[PDB]
Design a protein around this nucleic acid. Structure first.
Ligand SMILES: Nc1ncnc2c1ncn2[C@@H]1O[C@H](COP(=O)(O)OP(=O)(O)OP(=O)(O)O)[C@@H](O)[C@H]1O
Ligand SMILES: Nc1ncnc2c1ncn2[C@@H]1O[C@H](COP(=O)(O)OP(=O)(O)OP(=O)(O)O)[C@@H](O)[C@H]1O
Ligand SMILES: [Mg+2]
Ligand SMILES: [Mg+2]
Lengths: 290, 372, 401, 56
DNA sequence: AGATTTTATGTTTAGATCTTTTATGCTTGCTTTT
DNA sequence: AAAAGCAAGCATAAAAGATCTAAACATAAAATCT
């Protein structure tokens, strides 16, 4: 792979083949055990999902050693959660100190106190959604520096080694391994990190006066191809759809909560009330209400 | 004593046994509990709807059934009552009398999971007002809704909330796995005839049906179901009609005049008058509605000078504008200094003119362009 | 040991006494008539029956008597601008109900009360309501659990309990758990709670309460309108009794100039006390109208022209040059550099030299500590921004006339 | 799905008696592991001796 | 009848939140040299 | 005529600024060991 800069300056059979590929990567495992015994850490950099491969390594080989699986594709994990997990469950040392590097110093002391109590550490997606900051990678490199702790990890993003400087890449004593499974990224993309019908479904739950207020904004939008707030207020007080200003502000706050209406303030202080839907579907919606 | 106090007592707005308006919802909830009992499988559920529509009344009715008392272990937790979002597991342990090694929420969660893995009876965990459990990471709500998908767990949990889309917007991650996402049940707001049937149930439980003629009940429900549709405001105006008629008359059925008067009811100091007139003048004459307290006071002093009456100082003018703010006529956006606070009118001038009730003065202030 | 004292305090077994005077208070008969008016005019002396609040008394009385006799429970929200007789009317209704329940004309009832500004935290109300029941001081979690055990569980013979709640807007916060519990407890049939909530803003349930909390608060409501020109006169002439120590035109001027500002009754009862103290030092025994005019000019004070006239001459040149730069540049916020250039122009006109800018920053700091101007911290000299806090015409009125 | 794939937790302990040489005896008693450990200890100690004698 | 963790509680500080306000940047819409 | 270049415009977002809250830290009540 030797990219050209001119692109920047000008800017079935598959199941059996995948099973043979997975059986070869399953055959690699004793070599990984010897490589982890010599102090190197394992890094996988294939195309497809490597979740099942590292789960098979935890299941078939590390069935009795201490293991902390870490799901790096989790949107909401924190490095405090992982250090708290090690400090509380592996060592029974209680909660880790609030400074993460103090927690790594504590983990290094307590793991210096116990030889031949190895802690395997499997991190699916070391380039995770909350591990992409430099600080969490510094914590993971300081943890992988420990002789007791061994590390297996997955890599998926193309720009991952931009956050590993030579100090982290020396603490991460990686043995790179091309584990290119062709499996789809189901679990890695299942999480949160990666409409006229909904408008009808929320319009059905509204009361009659809320239907009248939204129909007034719909009629003004189709008539003008966002309405100022004062016209909606005078139209509602003429049609008796509201008691005072504050109930109308509560109804528009409910519409902002259910995203039927976008409120764009003007420089003059008037509030504009756009409906964020194209006018053909809005005309069909007005025809649906008749 | 008399029929007036009898109807005022029976409109009540407390817990009830009969629920005439919610019948298909009760049958659907009973069918959900019954099919998930007969299949012996777990099943999450999310009931939602506008306040006052009767969700807690239906689930309080269904947590007192003798047959469900025989078949499943009911638990009701009001989620406002907990000290914190993470403390709810501890409260659940007190609802199940589980033994816990104690004094950390993690061991309470492990005790609840150890009970769920080997429970002898099906568990019905109703979490009323589940919107209080939402935080940011939302570890607690996802941990609770992951319990039906746990291997061998027999919990079936119901979450009551006011939001139509709290499940999707607050729990997008449950959509990825169809075994995890709750079945949804809306509770639609009450119609006019449903509020009339609730009134005709409550007034016939005490046989005080005659104090309300049907015409004025069909006026009251036509107003309330059009405005909001909650039965709490409907029973409140129905109680208020009788407690105003008792004060007013001291059997007379209530007329439409009394209910129309209470429905039209429900649904100044001179310096405050001068402040409102100068604010209306500055809002009319100027395209820029960014009015500060100092920019308003400098015009108010000139208006008081031309009216030949003494003006308040800025330290008293700030308290005067704060007293006008309590009526809802204004809203003051606070800033670093009292002079820099931004007045914002919240009534239209056609309401402010009818509220001041001194048209000869407002005609003088609004024709006084030269003092700006 | 201190721990026995704290345990006897938290158990309520020692009453918190305050030290008594060494000397006896003076006898009532030695007082002058003007002193008798000065002590009848104190705001702490609530009348046994409030003038000009009869309609609100009938409203709160009919609500509370119906909620007590029906044994059902419920809630009410009274509101109005401060000093308008809210809490005095509610406690007067509750004292009348207690006098009636003492004579067995009414069922007996408990009367809890709290106030939202006497609590450091919204949850501390759970500590206080329980303290009006058992008298023990406990943590708010145990107090909330014991209050739920008291109210959710039907325990005959339960007595009706009226929970007055002043200062409802302080108890709100973001979660609104405390106000939700206080308004949700009456809805349960087992609790006979009748909660009354006093507040200032009329629009509070719609402005800052949640939709379910507003739905629980209900539609029964009462608004205390500000006292008018006449009701403030009736209040003060009821406080004075039959005494003629106040002229009627003096009370009329106090009421006319207090009702035009706020409608507060405390302002009238304080201005009349100050007028009595002013008449006392003149050795007159009747509060004539010029004593009321002096007390009104003192207690509706406007002493900024006196501050500009009392400033040192370089500070007056500074106050002229800030308004000169505001007139010149148009915008109301001026940097210190152009203010100093206008200072040098005005000082060259008047003939006095001006202090160098390190002393002009001391002048700006003095005016900003006196709040004649708004100004930043002095560490960023020549580029600090100088708002004028006094109006521009007040400076010319001070330094010309 | 898999028990490791949870919607709530992000880390999953599999503790086996941790309190407060990975290979079995077949590999360590093999002669090639003995000669590899011998050559590696000799080479690493000589390089550390060179680094100390350069820093001294 | 006295010392020791043990636990429940209150305080304080760091972090989440609401809100305004200000800005670079992402895109657009012409605009203009080669 | 082709593709680089200047005002325009909404928008994520960035500061910020108050503000509220959750967890870490100091501390007191108390079973526990002697
Ligand atoms: N269908 C009905 N028939 C008769 N009475 C009803 C019905 N629904 C509700 N009510 C009355 O309304 C009162 C309030 O209902 P409920 O508390 O169940 O509403 P909610 O949805 O729980 O309100 P929130 O969402 O604010 O908690 C109940 O005490 C009950 O007496
Ligand atoms: N109608 C009245 N007649 C006689 N005295 C009155 C009247 N109204 C108010 N006062 C006097 O003014 C004081 C007002 O106190 P009160 O507790 O009523 O004020 P409040 O409206 O509760 O104020 P806030 O709303 O700030 O709490 C009372 O002590 C009373 O002596
Ligand atoms: Mg409810
Ligand atoms: Mg009060």
């Amino acid at each position: 792979f030797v990219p050209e800069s001119d692109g920047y300056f000008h800017s079935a059979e598959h199941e059996g083949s995948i099973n043979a590929i997975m059986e070869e990567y399953r055959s690699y495992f004793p070599k990984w055990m010897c490589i982890l015994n010599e102090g190197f850490n394992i890094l996988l950099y294939g195309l497809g999902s490597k979740h099942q491969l590292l789960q098979s390594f935890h299941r078939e080989v590390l069935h009795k050693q201490t293991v902390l699986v870490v799901n790096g594709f989790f949107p909401s994990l924190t490095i405090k959660d992982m250090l708290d997990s090690i400090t509380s469950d592996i060592l029974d040392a209680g909660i880790s100190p609030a400074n993460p590097h103090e927690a790594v110093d504590m983990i290094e002391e307590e793991f210096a106190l116990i030889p031949e109590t190895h802690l395997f550490l499997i991190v699916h997606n070391l380039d995770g959604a909350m591990l992409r900051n430099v600080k969490a990678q510094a914590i993971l490199s300081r943890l992988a520096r420990i002789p007791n702790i061994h590390l297996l990890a997955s890599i998926d993003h193309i720009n991952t080694p931009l956050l590993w400087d030579q100090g982290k890449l020396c603490s991460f004593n990686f043995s790179w391994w091309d584990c290119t499974t062709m499996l789809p990224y189901t679990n890695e993309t299942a999480f949160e990190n990666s409409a006229l019908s909904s408008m009808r479904s929320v319009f059905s739950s509204l009361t009659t006066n809320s239907r009248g207020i939204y129909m007034l904004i719909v009629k003004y939008q189709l008539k003008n191809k966002g309405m100022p707030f004062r016209d909606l207020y005078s139209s509602c007080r003429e049609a008796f759809l509201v008691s005072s200003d504050l109930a109308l502000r509560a109804q528009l706050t409910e519409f902002l909560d259910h995203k039927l209406v976008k409120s764009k303030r003007s420089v003059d202080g008037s509030e504009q009330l756009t409906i964020p839907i194209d006018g053909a579907l809005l005309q069909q919606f007005l025809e649906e209400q008749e | 004593r008399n029929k007036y106090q009898n109807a005022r007592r029976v409109l009540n707005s407390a817990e009830t046994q009969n629920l005439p308006g919610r019948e298909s919802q009760l049958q659907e909830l009973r069918e959900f509990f019954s099919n998930h009992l007969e299949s012996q499988t777990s099943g999450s559920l999310y009931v939602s709807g506008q306040p006052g529509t009767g969700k807690t009344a239906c689930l309080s009715l269904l947590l007192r059934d003798p047959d469900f008392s025989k078949r499943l272990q009911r638990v009701y937790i009001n989620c406002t009552s907990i000290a914190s979002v993470g403390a709810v597991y501890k409260k659940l342990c007190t609802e199940l009398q589980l033994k816990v090694s104690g004094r950390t929420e993690r061991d309470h969660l492990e005790a609840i999971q150890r009970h769920l893995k080997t429970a002898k009876r099906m568990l019905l965990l109703v979490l009323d007002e589940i919107d209080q459990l939402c935080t940011s990471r939302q570890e607690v709500l996802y941990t609770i809704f992951e319990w039906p998908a746990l291997p061998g767990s027999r919990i079936l949990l119901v979450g009551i909330a006011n939001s139509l889309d709290l499940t999707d917007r607050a729990l997008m991650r449950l959509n990825a796995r169809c075994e995890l996402k709750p079945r949804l049940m809306h509770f639609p707001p009450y119609s006019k005839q449903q509020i009339v049937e609730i009134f005709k149930s409550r007034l016939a439980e005490a046989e005080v049906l005659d104090v309300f003629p049907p015409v004025t009940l069909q006026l009251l429900a036509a107003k309330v179901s059009a405005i909001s549709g909650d039965v709490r405001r409907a029973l409140d105006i129905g109680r208020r009609v009788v407690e105003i008629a008792e004060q007013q008359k001291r059997l007379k059925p209530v007329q439409v005049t009394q209910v129309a008067a209470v429905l039209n009811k429900v649904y100044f100091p001179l310096q405050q008058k001068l402040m409102l007139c100068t604010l209306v003048l500055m809002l009319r004459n100027e395209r820029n509605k960014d009015i500060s307290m100092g920019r308003l006071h400098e015009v108010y002093r000139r208006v008081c000078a031309k009216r030949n009456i003494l003006a308040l100082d800025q330290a008293e003018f700030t308290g005067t504008v704060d007293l006008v703010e309590t009526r809802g006529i204004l809203r003051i956006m606070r800033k670093k200094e009292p002079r820099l606070h931004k007045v914002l009118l919240q009534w239209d001038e056609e309401e402010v003119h009818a509220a001041l009730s001194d048209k000869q003065l407002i005609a003088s202030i609004l024709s006084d362009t030269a003092c700006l | 040991t201190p721990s026995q004292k704290m345990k006897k305090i938290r158990a309520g077994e020692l009453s918190p006494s305050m030290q008594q005077r060494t000397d006896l208070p003076a006898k009532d008969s030695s007082k002058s008539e003007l002193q008798l008016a000065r002590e009848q005019l104190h705001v702490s002396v609530v009348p046994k029956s409030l003038p000009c609040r009869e309609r609100e008394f009938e409203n709160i009385y009919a609500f509370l008597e119906g909620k007590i006799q029906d044994q059902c429970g419920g809630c009410m929200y009274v509101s109005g601008v401060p000093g308008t007789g809210k809490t005095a009317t509610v406690t007067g209704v509750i004292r009348t109900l207690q006098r009636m329940a003492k004579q067995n004309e009414l069922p007996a009832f408990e009367y809890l009360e709290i106030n939202g500004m006497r609590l450091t935290e919204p949850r501390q109300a759970y500590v206080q309501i329980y303290k009006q029941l058992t008298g023990k001081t406990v943590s708010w979690e145990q107090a909330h659990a014991l209050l739920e055990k008291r109210f959710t569980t039907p325990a005959p013979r339960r007595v009706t309990t009226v929970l007055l709640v002043d200062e409802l807007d302080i108890l709100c916060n973001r979660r609104q758990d405390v106000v939700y519990n206080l308004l949700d407890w009456p809805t349960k049939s087992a609790a006979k709670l009748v909660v009354v909530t006093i507040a200032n803003t009329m629009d509070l349930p719609e402005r800052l309460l949640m939709g379910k909390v507003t739905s629980r608060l209900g539609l029964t409501r009462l608004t205390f309108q500000p006292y008018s020109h006449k009701q403030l006169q009736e209040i003060v002439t009821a406080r004075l009794g039959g005494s003629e120590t106040f002229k009627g035109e003096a009370v009329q001027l106090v009421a006319r100039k207090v009702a035009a500002v706020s409608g507060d009754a405390r302002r009238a009862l304080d201005i009349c006390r100050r007028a009595t103290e002013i008449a006392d030092t003149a050795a007159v025994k009747c509060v004539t109208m010029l004593h009321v005019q002096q007390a009104l000019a003192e207690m509706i004070a406007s002493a900024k022209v006196q501050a500009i006239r009392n400033c040192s001459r370089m500070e007056q040149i500074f106050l002229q040059a800030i308004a000169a730069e505001v007139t010149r540049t148009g915008v109301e916020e001026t940097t210190f550099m152009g203010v100093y250039q206008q200072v040098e122009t005005i000082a060259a006109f008047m003939g006095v030299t001006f202090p160098p800018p390190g002393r002009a920053l001391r002048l700006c700091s003095k005016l900003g500590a006196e709040r004649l101007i708004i100004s930043e911290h002095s560490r960023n000299d020549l580029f600090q921004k100088i708002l004028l806090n006094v109006s521009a015409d007040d400076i010319h009125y001070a330094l010309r006339v | 799905m898999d028990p490791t794939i949870s919607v709530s937790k992000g880390c999953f302990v599999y503790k086996n008696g941790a309190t407060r040489s990975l290979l079995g005896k077949e590999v360590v008693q093999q002669p090639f592991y003995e000669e590899y450990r011998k050559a590696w200890n000799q080479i690493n100690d000589h390089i550390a001796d060179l680094q100390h004698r350069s820093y001294a």
